[PDB]
């Protein structure tokens with residue numbers, strides 16, 4: 354695999370979003386991976402609906418949190434609508450998929466990266482954007498403005514994001530806190546430290562969609 358990956362340069366990443374106060378990071382994280390795999394497989398970059406996952410993933414808990422895996426399983430077992438058809442409201446409502454016509458995209462499965470394994474995560478990122486989790490509660494992460502982030506941070510993961518690239522010393526993360534946070538919405542998190550958890554627990558739980 355190459356020394357640098359940046360899915361933005363391949364036209365596989367949509368603009369940075371802001372989840373607001375709702376605990377919907379799990380849905381935002383999943384959607385980034387769907388937008389990516391559909392571009393990689395079909396050549397078209399579209400925005401898909403975080404709100405639909407928020408409303409319809411019965412294994413998750415709406416704005417009280419949820420699971421990227423379950424959201425990705427939903428897209429594989431049913432599908433997902435375009436964001437324009439099912440726009441983001443920042444609050445959980447009833448599932449409205451059947452009212453909104455046929456699904457726009459559908460995947461074929463979900464896979465988990467072997468946890469606590471930097472190289473396995475880099476391999477997956479080289480193939481497509483990946484849903485990852487980290488500890489975002491610390492003030493250092495909250496206040497991040499730029500550079501390769503080394504912490505301080507623990508490994509008590511609490512926030513799902515998406516890995517969209519890497520380089521020799523970092524993994525490139527698309528966050529869902531708007532374009533005014535970090536590097537225009539992104540953070541580069543240090544890698545190669547030899548801590549199996551990853552910086553901020555980044556290697557704890559990583560999933561990606563499969564599409565034939």
Ligand SMILES: *[C@@H](C(=O)O)[C@H](O)C(=O)N[C@H](C(=O)NCCCCCCCCN)C1CCC1
Pocket residue numbers: 372375376377378379414417418419420421486487510511512513
């Ligand atoms: C992430 C965010 O910042 O929006 C969000 O808090 C999240 O989904 N976190 C997530 C998580 O904690 N998932 C489980 C939620 C369980 C709620 C239980 C409610 C019922 C209690 N009786 C994980 C993935 C990131 C860490």
